[PDB]
């Protein structure tokens, strides 16, 4: 389902929703990722029209993570080696 993407050039390696509490997390608005992260008190959720804009926030350092669907996240990270998928499939 969902995975957590973070910067490769970081020691931050979240594996669960709880690991995102306190962090700025970019999501594509209205996706499962948005809906799920929004359930956890203390995640600072930043919503974007396009997932690519969520990823841009992460690449620039203005967000700490992105939560998105596995296949879409994989196809993007494939071409963005400054990013890494730090989780397996999240248990939602």
Automatic annotation (TrEMBL):
Judging by the UniProt lineage, the source's domain of life is Bacteria
Name by which UniProt lists this protein: Amino acid ABC transporter, periplasmic amino acid-binding protein
Protein source organism: Thermotoga maritima (strain ATCC 43589 / DSM 3109 / JCM 10099 / NBRC 100826 / MSB8)
Task: Read off the lineage from the record.
Answer: Bacteria, Thermotogati, Thermotogota, Thermotogae, Thermotogales
Indicate the span of the full protein covered. 115 to 206 of 246
């Amino acid at each position: 389902g969902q995975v957590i993407v973070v910067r490769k050039d970081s020691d931050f390696r979240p594996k669960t929703y709880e690991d995102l509490v306190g962090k700025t997390v970019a999501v594509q608005i209205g996706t499962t990722g948005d809906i799920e992260v929004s359930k956890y008190d203390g995640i600072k959720v930043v919503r974007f029209d396009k997932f690519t804009d969520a990823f841009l926030e992460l690449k620039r350092g203005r967000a700490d993570a992105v939560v998105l669907d596995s296949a879409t996240a994989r196809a993007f990270v494939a071409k963005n080696p400054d990013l890494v998928i730090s989780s397996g499939v999240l248990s939602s």
